[PDB]
Amino acid sequence: ARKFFVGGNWKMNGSKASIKSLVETLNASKLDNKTEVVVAPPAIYLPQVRQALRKDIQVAAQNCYTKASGAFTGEISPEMLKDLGIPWVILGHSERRHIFGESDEFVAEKVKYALDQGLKVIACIGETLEEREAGKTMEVCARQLKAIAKKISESDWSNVVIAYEPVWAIGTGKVATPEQAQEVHAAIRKWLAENVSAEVAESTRIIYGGSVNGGNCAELAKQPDIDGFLVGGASLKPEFVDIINARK
Template identity: 45%
Template sequence: MTSKTDRRIVAGNWKMNTTPSEGSVLAQGVIDKVAAPVGKVIFGVPAIQLVKIKQLTAAAEGYYVAAQNMHQKADGAFTGEMSAAMLADARIDYVILGHSERRQYSGEDDTLINAKIVAALDAGIIPIYCCGEKLDIRESNNQNVVVGKQIEQALSALSPKQMAKVVVAYEPVWAIGTGKTASPQQAQEMHAFIRQMISDQFGSEIANGISILYGGSVKAANAEELFGMADVDGGLVGGASLDAQAFADIIKAGQ
């Protein structure tokens, strides 16, 4: 049976931050501070930095690189986009899909995100699928309905073999960049709900093997308690991942 340690992932989403030179310094700083992480550490970096950060992490055990988005088509007249094949050829390990900022600013829905997930899996890239509810949904206690629908629409059409490779990141929209954080109990409840949904469709073995990450104002001060919850396998970290010491402290939380 897969252990919680086996499922552990701490991923940093740099978003549209850091120049290439700054990003190299940041990534190297984290590696220098945590030479042997428990589980996996992922740098989710701007497209212009993917190849450089991949080269930098190649000799660093436990470190991986994620793109922040990709196009669902294999090729074509899609100016400014990247395909899964391009990422695979650059040996990029992961891709973040369905982030709330992509949903909000680019109008992405779970039908489109499902197509991206399938394209990533077909190319051998592991998708980190983001889901989560807005504040009004949480306040009306409808978070399970909304997140359940997101999980169903984006993931239910996958085969068990495909689903076993997916990473899920629960990111309550109301906690992203706001300084608000879901309580450890709230995070656990949602993570358990997501794992149960996956178990109901794909079986307990696959559900127990999947990493479910929490994202939303994760900091060194709250990471240990969050990561200590039974179904919280790590974090997808935003702002705190831009500081080498802060991110290193999060990586080491609860180890």
């Protein structure tokens, strides 16, 4: 069975003091040992967190670039992340696609380069409010996934978790209903089966993000094609523990 997966995306939030307190809370918490947990601090706090955090929670960067090294002021390579012992990276997050203009292909290039350099990837996809209203959610998700599949192999998928995050659900306090999320997850899984392989479809975690909190996580977690969550706002708070424990 697919191991339940909960990721915390801290985004551009944190200080030494606030992170120390967040990590202390996590370090004292009783977590379901069947949940794979990853947290993603801002890049400059990766060392602090990797040092201080319980080793059964893994650390992620929030972005990386497509080359080993070179003249890319302000960018970090996957090699650097491995060097510092950071096993995961979030790629293609809605904010990077929509605010920072990362194309489907650029995201796909990052995913391939990160995997080839030994990182595990949370690959983010999802539709805008307008695309949802048009009934084109899966067409968008399919386009974003196809770009990734063009650049990575069948075997490469073993270290990918797909995060489905409707743009209209991110930070808006409007969560997808269990029906809405389940339908997309089942459709993504079918896409994987038809375009990549049945084995990749059966094995790949598809996690939901967009306004997940302590109050709505349990019902979402009961859906047969939802394998966990990518948590933004709630990941900064003690209720993150309740989400890790959503199946408990």
